[PDB]
Write a protein that binds this ligand. Structure first.
Ligand SMILES: Nc1ncnc2c1ncn2[C@@H]1O[C@H](COP(=O)(O)OP(=O)(O)O)[C@@H](O)[C@H]1O
Lengths: 300, 303
């Protein structure tokens, strides 16, 4: 049993990815080798991957894709990547062709959960409350300001004026060919809940961000059970595997599902702390993640 | 300009993928080398891949990823049908190679390949689809409509499909579908029904070909009321836009009792001499070589 942990990436969250790698490595209860995708896309292996991990950044790598690895020595791959190339199904699809088990959601769920237009389309069709939004490709917005203008696939510029719209599109178009424009909520409470499992997952306690984490979140009992049920329902509809951190918005008790993150930060990070308060310690959480990937691959 | 054409695959459409290659190799206006994915998963290159001349490759030489000289090509043309072809897996590998490639990207490929997730996207956008429910292995089915149904694996793309005419034969159909995918769909089987198909060309903002029809004869163009054929192209271009498809797609519709229903989108359709997609754009004024050149060009344009 040996795990291949991939960290870094080409997305702007490259440095956050290496922060989660140091967390996973120190606790994961399996022999684990580290792979680092540098910011130029070239891979770093062996001692050079651990050195760049201590540097919290890999500006340039050595090995072009595909890297010189014997995939037959790794039983499970852990794509600990965030954003483009890592969370949107590309890395997932390559590991599928490779016949390799891997932690996290599949190709379809990764691409969908990383798309803020299409995921909202599926969630809304399933009856899940989401923020009113429109999709703008590289502009008709039916609701009045303020908006939140975001690129469709990322892991953002507040707009209070209609004349301030075509400028927020260019900042969002810097990261994508498509953007979303959704109605701003203020004031808003942000709720987050971790899910663990393949399709039919179990929920952690609900937490709240305010950078301060409230675990558990100060919620009336029916509201947090609604959060847990909305998370498990969206999780199952989207066919998410392994894990996901589902984020919500809360006005009064008007809950809106914000987004699903298939590769949550994995340092103190919210997702491990949520299942820590739910009786799943960080090593046991990583152990079940590796076993959920083997259970899906070799038994489904 | 040198293009690599990947054909074959591990899916039941392995033979038809090789036929589509011979059609693309018939008149692509570029020098093009052929790489074949055999049915066992290993790849054949060089003249052994061409030795395509046998119409079936049971065994291959190189395990994935193959020792292929990707730097010697300007575009990749994945001509694989079904799983490990149209489902984003190959494209994700090409995305990580940095090679521009023909066809839809990872997002649209996997989504159009999923018979359940695509219909949810399409129905929310206001595009008509047939009544359907998803059935996940382990939880019992809940079908609000009455037979006859179609029962298919959600993301497999022809094995595992059943026509269920008795509500009690549903459990056997789900057992068969759950042999190939953890999720199935139960679609209402329309009858009588006509099969209408139309091609789309372009990057997200595409152009529609004349509508076709399968009666097996291909009616090009299809004999449709002037309003219905305009609605087909309108629904085709819209679904093509919402899903963010790049390159090409063959959009299959059902026509029952005056109502249109989008059946599915095909991101890597057939390219055989019999196939519907190239003929539909020939009738539309786009030659077979001009189609492949623009497909190659659109791959470089998005890149
Ligand atoms: N409609 C909205 N109303 C109020 N606050 C919002 C809205 N959309 C985003 N935000 C704020 O901005 C942040 C945007 O994060 P999110 O939309 O989840 O993008 P990412 O996927 O990059 O996290 C949220 O955490 C929230 O605090």
């Amino acid at each position: 049993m040996r795990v291949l942990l991939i960290a870094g990436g080409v997305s702007p969250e490259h440095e956050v990815s290496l922060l989660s790698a140091e967390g996973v490595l120190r606790h994961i209860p399996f022999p684990t080798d580290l792979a680092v995708i540098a910011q130029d896309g070239r891979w770093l292996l062996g001692e050079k991957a651990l050195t760049a991990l201590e540097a919290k950044a890999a500006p340039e790598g050595e090995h072009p894709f595909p890297p010189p690895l014997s995939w037959e020595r790794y039983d499970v791959v852990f794509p600990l990547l965030h954003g483009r190339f890592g969370e949107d199904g590309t890395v997932q699809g390559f590991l599928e062709l490779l016949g390799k088990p891997y932690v996290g959601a599949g190709v379809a769920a990764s691409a969908l959960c990383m798309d803020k237009d299409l995921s909202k389309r599926v969630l809304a069709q399933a009856g899940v409350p989401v923020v009113p939004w429109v999709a703008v490709r590289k502009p008709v917005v039916p609701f009045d300001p303020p908006f939140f203008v975001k690129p469709a696939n990322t892991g953002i510029s507040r707009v209070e004026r209609f004349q301030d719209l075509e400028a927020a599109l260019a900042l969002a178009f810097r990261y994508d060919e498509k953007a979303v424009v959704e109605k701003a909520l203020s004031p808003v409470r942000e709720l987050e809940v971790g899910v663990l499992g393949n399709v039919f997952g179990e929920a952690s306690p609900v937490g709240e961000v305010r950078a301060e984490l409230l675990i558990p979140a100060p919620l009336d009992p029916g509201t947090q059970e609604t959060v847990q049920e909305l998370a498990l329902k969206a999780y199952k509809v989207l066919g998410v595997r392994g894990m996901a951190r589902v984020d919500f918005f809360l006005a009064e008790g008007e809950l809106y599902l914000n987004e699903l993150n298939t590769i949550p930060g994995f340092t103190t990070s919210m997702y491990p702390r949520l299942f820590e308060a739910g009786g799943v310690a960080y090593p046991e959480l990583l152990r079940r993640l590796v076993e959920l990937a083997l259970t899906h691959h070799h038994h489904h």
